[PDB]
Amino acid sequence: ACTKNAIAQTGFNKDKYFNGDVWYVTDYLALEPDDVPKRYCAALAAGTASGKLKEALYHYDPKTQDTFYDVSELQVESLGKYTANFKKVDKNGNVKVAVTAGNYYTFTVMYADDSSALIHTCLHKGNKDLGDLYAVLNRNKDAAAGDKVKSAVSAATLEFSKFISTKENNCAYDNDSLKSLLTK
Numbered sequence: 001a002c003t004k005n006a007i008a009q010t011g012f013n014k015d016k017y018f019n020g021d022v023w024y025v026t027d028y029l030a031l032e033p034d035d036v037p038k039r040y041c042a043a044l045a046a047g048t049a050s051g052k053l054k055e056a057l058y059h060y061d062p063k064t065q066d067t068f069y070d071v072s073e074l075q076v077e078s079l080g081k082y083t084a085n086f087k088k089v090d091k092n093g094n095v096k097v098a099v100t101a102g103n104y105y106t107f108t109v110m111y112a113d114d115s116s117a118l119i120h121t122c123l124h125k126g127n128k129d130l131g132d133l134y135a136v137l138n139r140n141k142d143a144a145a146g147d148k149v150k151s152a153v154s155a156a157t158l159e160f161s162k163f164i165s166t167k168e169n170n171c172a173y174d175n176d177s178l179k180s181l182l183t184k
Ligand code: HEM
Pocket: 025, 028, 035, 036, 037, 039, 040, 041, 042, 043, 044, 057, 059, 068, 069, 070, 086, 087, 088, 097, 104, 105, 107, 121, 123, 125, 128, 129, 130, 133, 135
């Protein structure tokens, strides 16, 4: 179960975040710990495509090799706070699992600048829900979390020390597929 009403960044700059580029997850915190594996790789692209607000997601479990992509259109609840109805696709945008009622995530940008961000997401997916999940993002897949984003983690009354890093997983991404999935 999700439990947090995450607060969006004051003065969030939507066009800069949703610029069509890629964000890498460098660290994550699942509130229900056995909710997700202890080793993971995830990234997204976020942009407007033909007037529509979009995200493309990539998940990879580096131990099992489980891999999946998703595309969503985001609807706006308030500045920096969205509800997204996802379709599972291959890397080329071919639909594997269509959009359906009940399959959605919420997405809140708690902090962002040109290079880093802190987000919250709540996944709803039939009998495969996840609880609250926070992620530190960077434009550079190898960047250690800096002071701006770590201060934002503190300001959210979270302990960065509890976040799990993705950096020791040999994560390798297909940026081209994430960018082109925005259109799909
Ligand atoms: C970056 C922000 C993230 C968003 C918006 C997000 C969103 C999603 C969505 C929409 C799905 C379902 C996809 C489908 O069935 O087609 C999913 C599944 C999953 N995600 Fe994430 N995710 C993110 C990051 C992460 C991270 C960092 C982890 C763990 C390190 C993670 C772990 C999982 C797992 C294990 C599943 C499959 C299990 C399930 O569907 O219940 N995700 N995620």
